[PDB]
Structure 1
Amino acid sequence: FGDIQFGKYLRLSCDTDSETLYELLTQHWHLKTPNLVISVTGGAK
């Protein structure tokens, strides 16, 4: 758990279902979305 300061980070297992992650990130945290944009890059150092 815990905040990050120099945001909110979380270590979580891969085998969890996405519905309780959505319930975490929308109920305990900020609101819903009209849109969701994804970007793929990160193999480029």
Structure 2
Amino acid sequence: FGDIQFGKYLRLSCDTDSETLYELLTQHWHLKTPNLVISVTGGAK
């Protein structure tokens, strides 16, 4: 848990279901989405 300052980060197991993640990130945090964009890059150093 906890903030980062130089945002809210989190260490998480891969085996959790996505619904508790979404309920966390919408209820305890900011609101819903009319849209959702995905960019894939990260092998590009």
Q: Taking structure 1 as the reference length, what is the TM-score of the superposition?
A: 0.99
Unaligned 5+ runs, structure 2 = none
Q: Which runs of 4+ in 1 moved over 3 A?
A: none
Question: Residue 11 of structure 1: CA displacement?
Answer: 0.2
Distance 2:39 2:19 in 1: 22
Deviation at 1:22, TM superposition (A): 0.2
Deviation at 1:13, TM superposition (A): 0.2
Structure 1 unaligned runs (5+)? none
Q: Report percent identity of matched pairs.
A: 100
Q: CA RMSD in A?
A: 0.2
Summarize deviations over 1:3-33 as a string: whole Å, max 9, x none: 0000000000000000000000000000000
